[PDB]
RNA sequence: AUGUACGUCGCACUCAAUAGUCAGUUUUCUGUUUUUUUUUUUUUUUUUUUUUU
């Protein structure tokens, strides 16, 4: 999957429930080398289901929330400059749409 | 002046009684009194689900 990315501008991955996909794939977004450029965007239906994988990155890089791997909810905006992965739902994405039309504050979205 | 005239009669009530004509299969329901009032205005009733500068 480190592979397809950087062979095609739309990769599609299906996973299980004990896949894991959910807390890796932004991992494979810094090894390739984005994060750096653009923020690397991780789209969630729910807030508690974008929150608690949140930490579970940050847990796994030994970092803590709100600092790299950080997320943006309604109002949490656990964002620091020095960020790369931004946890946020479908609507907080579609909330920044205005804001952003071409959506410059990323590089990755997932 | 003289002489001159008299006798019998009838009526009523009535009036009865008569020609011929034989027969009609068996069985059945229908039937009685009594408490009487017929009618009493009604109520609020349940939940997939999930995300937004």
């Given at each position: 999957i480190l592979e397809a990315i950087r062979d095609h501008q739309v990769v599609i991955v299906a996973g299980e429930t004990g896949s894991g996909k959910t807390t890796q794939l932004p991992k494979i977004c810094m090894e390739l080398?984005?994060?750096?450029?653009?923020l690397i965007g991780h789209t969630q239906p729910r807030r508690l289901a974008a929150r608690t994988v949140a930490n579970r990155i940050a847990e796994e890089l030994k970092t803590e929330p709100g600092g790299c791997i950080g997320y943006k909810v309604r109002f949490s905006?656990?964002?620091?400059?020095?960020?790369m992965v931004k946890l946020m739902t479908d609507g907080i994405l579609l909330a920044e749409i205005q804001q952003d039309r071409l959506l410059m504050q990323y590089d990755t979205i997932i």
């Open positions: 080398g984005r994060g750096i450029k653009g905006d656990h964002v620091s400059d020095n960020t």
